[PDB]
Amino acid sequence: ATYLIGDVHGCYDELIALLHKVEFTPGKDTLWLTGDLVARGPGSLDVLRYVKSLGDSVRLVLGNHDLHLLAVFAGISRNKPKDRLTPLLEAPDADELLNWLRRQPLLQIDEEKKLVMAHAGITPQWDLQTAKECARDVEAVLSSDSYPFFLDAMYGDMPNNWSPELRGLGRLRFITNAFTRMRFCFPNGQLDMYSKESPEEAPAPLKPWFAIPGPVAEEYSIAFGHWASLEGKGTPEGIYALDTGCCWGGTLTCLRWEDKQYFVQPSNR
Ligand SMILES: [Mn+2]
Ligand SMILES: [Mn+2]
């Protein structure tokens, strides 16, 4: 079977309890994870150890807090006490875990299921070929010996409009924002980097990225996490918002793909 789980945010106990609920069995089943495995919850270290141990039985995409962790590890960004990353950063296997993490994809595609996953979703300004090329470009810098330079460059809110003509730092910053930070779009598809509210509370003319018809969503289902204030609600057919705020005291949500059946684990806090 195929299971898709939203943002774990270091909630190791809830993750394992949820996988036991569905009797997840590596080798018979595959787990997809929307990213943001780390930060805020208490068990980022255990989560990373476990997900890395699954090997081919897990398909991960990187989220904005996974990239922040990599920036802290590389000395690019300052550690925030609220993220609770110190046990992972001080672990004896921190190098092994984080060098594995930076090699994971930004985008997962399964053609037989017609299923696409990314942390924040797929901007409607991208077709599938463009999404694949952009993911490959950022994955290449992250898996290279020079990834701290990219992590430093990635921070920024502009440009917010895609063009095939974008080059250099602006192109990478847009790609990173589209995959890992996106929520709202202007009607023409441009990213808004400021509003984090629910769709009902957002100022006009902002619309969720998934409310704007895009070429990927016309042909593929899209699963994503990231947008906790959405609470997993309000999406069109074929759009699966899996982040139900476990680390925030909400719940951890698991979707089984074959029958679209949901399983929920209450937050322990
Ligand atoms: Mn996120
Ligand atoms: Mn998150």
Domain boundaries in the chain?
2-266
Quickly list H helices, 127-167: 128-142, 147-154
Q: For residue 188, which phi and psi values (nearest 5 degrees)?
A: -80, 5
- The Cα–Cα gap between 242 and 233 comes to 9
Rounded to the nearest angstrom, the distance between the alpha carbon of 120 and the centre of ligand 2 is 9
In the block, residue with structure tokens 């699954």? 54
CB contact at 8 A, 56 and 26: no
Rounded to the nearest angstrom, the distance between the alpha carbon of 179 and the centre of ligand 2 is 13
- The Cα–Cα gap between 39 and 212 comes to 31
- The Cα–Cα gap between 196 and 190 comes to 15
Long-range contacts of 255-262 (CB under 8 A, 24+ apart): 255/3, 255/4, 255/5, 255/223, 256/1, 256/2, 256/3, 256/22, 257/1, 257/2, 257/3, 257/4, 257/113, 257/115, 258/1, 258/2
Rounded to the nearest angstrom, the distance between the alpha carbon of 178 and the centre of ligand 2 is 15
Task: Print the SS3 string covering 65-133.
Answer: HHHHHHHHHCCCCCCCHHHCCHHHHCCCCHHHHHHHHCCCCCEEEECCCCEEEECCCCCCCCCHHHHHH
Rounded to the nearest angstrom, the distance between the alpha carbon of 160 and the centre of ligand 2 is 21
CB contact at 8 A, 200 and 184: no
CATH code that applies to domain 2-266: 3.60.21.10
Rounded to the nearest angstrom, the distance between the alpha carbon of 13 and the centre of ligand 1 is 20
- Ligand closest to Cα of 245 equals 2
Amino acid at 248: W
Q: How was this structure determined?
A: X-ray
Rounded to the nearest angstrom, the distance between the alpha carbon of 5 and the centre of ligand 2 is 12
Rounded to the nearest angstrom, the distance between the alpha carbon of 136 and the centre of ligand 1 is 20
- Ligand closest to Cα of 180 equals 1
User: β-strand 251-256 against 261-266: which pairing, if any?
Assistant: antiparallel
- Ligand closest to Cα of 248 equals 2
- The Cα–Cα gap between 19 and 152 comes to 36
Amino acid at 251: T
Starting at the edge strand found earlier in the chain, the sheet holding 191-192 runs 191-192, 184-185, 207-208
Rounded to the nearest angstrom, the distance between the alpha carbon of 226 and the centre of ligand 2 is 4
Rounded to the nearest angstrom, the distance between the alpha carbon of 46 and the centre of ligand 1 is 19
Rounded to the nearest angstrom, the distance between the alpha carbon of 217 and the centre of ligand 1 is 20
* Beta-carbon count within 10 A of 177 CB: 22
- What are the CA-CA distances from residue 119 to residues 65, 95, 135 (Å)? 10, 24, 12
